[PDB]
Structure formats: structure tokens, C-alpha cells
Amino acid sequence: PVDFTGYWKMLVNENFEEYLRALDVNVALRKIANLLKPDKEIVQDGDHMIIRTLSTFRNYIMDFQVGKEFEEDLTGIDDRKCMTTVSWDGDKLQCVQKGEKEGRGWTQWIEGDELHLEMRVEGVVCKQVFKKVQHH
Ligand SMILES: C=C(C)[C@@H]1CCC(C)=C[C@H]1c1c(O)cc(C)cc1O
Numbered sequence: 001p002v003d004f005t006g007y008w009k010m011l012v013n014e015n016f017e018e019y020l021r022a023l024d025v026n027v028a029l030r031k032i033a034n035l036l037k038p039d040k041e042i043v044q045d046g047d048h049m050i051i052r053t054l055s056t057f058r059n060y061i062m063d064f065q066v067g068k069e070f071e072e073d074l075t076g077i078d079d080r081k082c083m084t085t086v087s088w089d090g091d092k093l094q095c096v097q098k099g100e101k102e103g104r105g106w107t108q109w110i111e112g113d114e115l116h117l118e119m120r121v122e123g124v125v126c127k128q129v130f131k132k133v134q135h136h
Helices: 016-022 027-035
Strands: 006-014 039-045 048-054 059-065 070-073 081-089 092-098 105-111 114-121 124-133
Touching: 016 027, 016 114, 016 124, 039 124, 059 070
Parallel strands: none
Antiparallel strands: 006 039, 006 124, 039 048, 048 059, 070 081, 081 092, 092 105, 105 114, 114 124
């Protein structure tokens, strides 16, 4: 039974700048964004998932139903809109973000006390790992 509910602190963030470059984010924001170490606050409530990615000056909030396509507004990332579906694949969450870019999506799973998140677009891959924490 995978349950992503919890508060999660960033441990590593690998190859994020190239991932953002593939989304056409210009170099100034790539460098700013890659220095950020946001937390994630997740509530999994049945198949209703809220994923809050939180940092001092910039946040990005996802709020969706697993299995149901929705219009994802990536405002503050690359400012595109996608038709996104997040689905269960065993104990992994598989996200496909349909839109102008090919092969855009991500995969999320848990190993022990680690939240693993691999994001992809146009064959470019970024890997993030977060640790479960208790100070809120
Ligand atoms: C803080 C947020 C929401 C920023 C917002 C700006 C950009 C382009 C990316 C986000 C980001 C992450 O989702 C995840 C990580 C690790 C860094 C990071 O910088």
C-alpha cells in the first residue's frame, strides 16, 4: 500500500538545468531554480492527491484525481498548459503531460523513507529524491 502523504525535504536534484532547458526556460531562471531546495507537502486522500512544492519565494501546487485527465497549468515553471493524467502503475505514480513537448511526464515512488521523482521531457531526464521529515 503506497501512501505519499507526508512532509518531504529535498535531498538531491540531478540534472534539473538540462530538464528546464528542454522546456525552453531561459538560463537565468534555470540557475535560480536549480539553487532552490523546496519541500513537498503531500496529502493522498483516496485517489485525490494534493502535492504542494514549497519554497520561500516560489511555490507550485498540483491538485488532481488519480486516473482522471485534467488541464495542468504549469504557471511559474515553463508557463505551458498540458492535458495531464496521473495514473497508478503498481506502486508507482505515472504522470503523462500531453502538450507541445514530446515525452513530457514524471514518475513518483517511495523507497523506505525516500520519495523518488523522475521527470522527463524530449528524452532529457532529471531525478529528485526527498526525505520524509517530521518538523512542520
Ligand atoms: C520551488 C519551485 C516550485 C520552483 C519554481 C520555479 C521552477 C522553474 C521550478 C520549481 C522547482 C521544483 O519544482 C523542484 C525543485 C527541486 C526545484 C525547483 O526550483
